[PDB]
Amino acid sequence: IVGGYTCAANSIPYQVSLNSGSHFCGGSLINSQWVVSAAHCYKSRIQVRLGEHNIDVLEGNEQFINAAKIITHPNFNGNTLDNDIMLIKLSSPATLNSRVATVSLPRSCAAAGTECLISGWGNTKSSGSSYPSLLQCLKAPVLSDSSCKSSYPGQITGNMICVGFLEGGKDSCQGDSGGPVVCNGQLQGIVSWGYGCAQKNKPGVYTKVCNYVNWIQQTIAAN
Ligand SMILES: *[B]1(O[C]C2=[C][C]=C(C([N])=[N+])[C]=[C]2)O[C][C]O1
Numbered sequence: 689i690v691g692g693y694t695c696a697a698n699s700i701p702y703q704v705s706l707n708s709g710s711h712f713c714g715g716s717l718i719n720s721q722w723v724v725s726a727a728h729c730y731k732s733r734i735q736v737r738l739g740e741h742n743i744d745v746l747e748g749n750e751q752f753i754n755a756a757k758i759i760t761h762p763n764f765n766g767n768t769l770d771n772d773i774m775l776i777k778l779s780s781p782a783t784l785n786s787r788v789a790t791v792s793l794p795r796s797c798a799a800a801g802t803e804c805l806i807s808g809w810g811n812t813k814s815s816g817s818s819y820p821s822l823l824q825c826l827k828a829p830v831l832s833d834s835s836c837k838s839s840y841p842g843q844i845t846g847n848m849i850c851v852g853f854l855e856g857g858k859d860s861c862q863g864d865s866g867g868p869v870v871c872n873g874q875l876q877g878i879v880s881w882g883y884g885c886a887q888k889n890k891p892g893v894y895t896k897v898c899n900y901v902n903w904i905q906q907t908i909a910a911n
């Protein structure tokens with residue numbers, strides 16, 4: 689997260705880290721057994737780390753639960769990042785408390801201008817790299833599908849939303865991929881792609897979660 693602030697510890701209780709020896713993507717807890725993330729974050733072994741703030745220090749809220757099942761969207765395109773969504777079933781249910789909670793799935797798509805909260809342990813610099821220990825947060829509005837298309841001509845499917853600041857300086861970045869964008873208490877985005885990070889006219893592009901409610905609830909019911 690570039691141009692953010694450090695979240696209050698555990699104020700984002702649905703944020704997970706996906707760990708493959710180290711943090712490589714984010715994800716969101718949507719059921720005691722299920723995390724949603726981006727299909728481009730797929731690996732055959734993932735340990736899910738819940739209740740993190742400092743991913744470099746054990747603070748005693750952490751639950752480390754390996755993935756039992758990892759299901760990419762059947763139509764995920766590795767090239768255009770269309771349908772950039774996957775589900776991860778945990779090998780045991782996460783205990784839900786104040787520090788580990790679910791986030792609702794959307795009941796409608798969000799309007800342009802809706803304030804959202806974006807989080808992760810991705811890079812914090814627009815120039816070079818600094819990967820933080822502490823979970824970063826960013827308040828950011830949903831952008832118009834028109835404004836998102838003008839930023840990226842012919843690259844935005846209907847399964848994509850822009851969220852951010854056309855001016856630059858405030859965006860997610862590499863290592864936030866797969867993590868949440870939550871607006872009015874609903875998971876509306878998954879950190880997907882962008883041309884660099886926090887550049888002028890290149891806002892973050894996010895998978896549009898309100899297109900996928902049927903697919904998610906089906907995969908859960910079947911597995
Ligand atoms: B991600 O990184 C991809 C990424 C995430 C966010 C932006 C952005 N908002 N400008 C750009 C690229 O995927 C694999 C590792 O983290």
Ligand SMILES: [Ca+2]
Nearest residue numbers: 742745746747
């Ligand atoms: Ca920790």
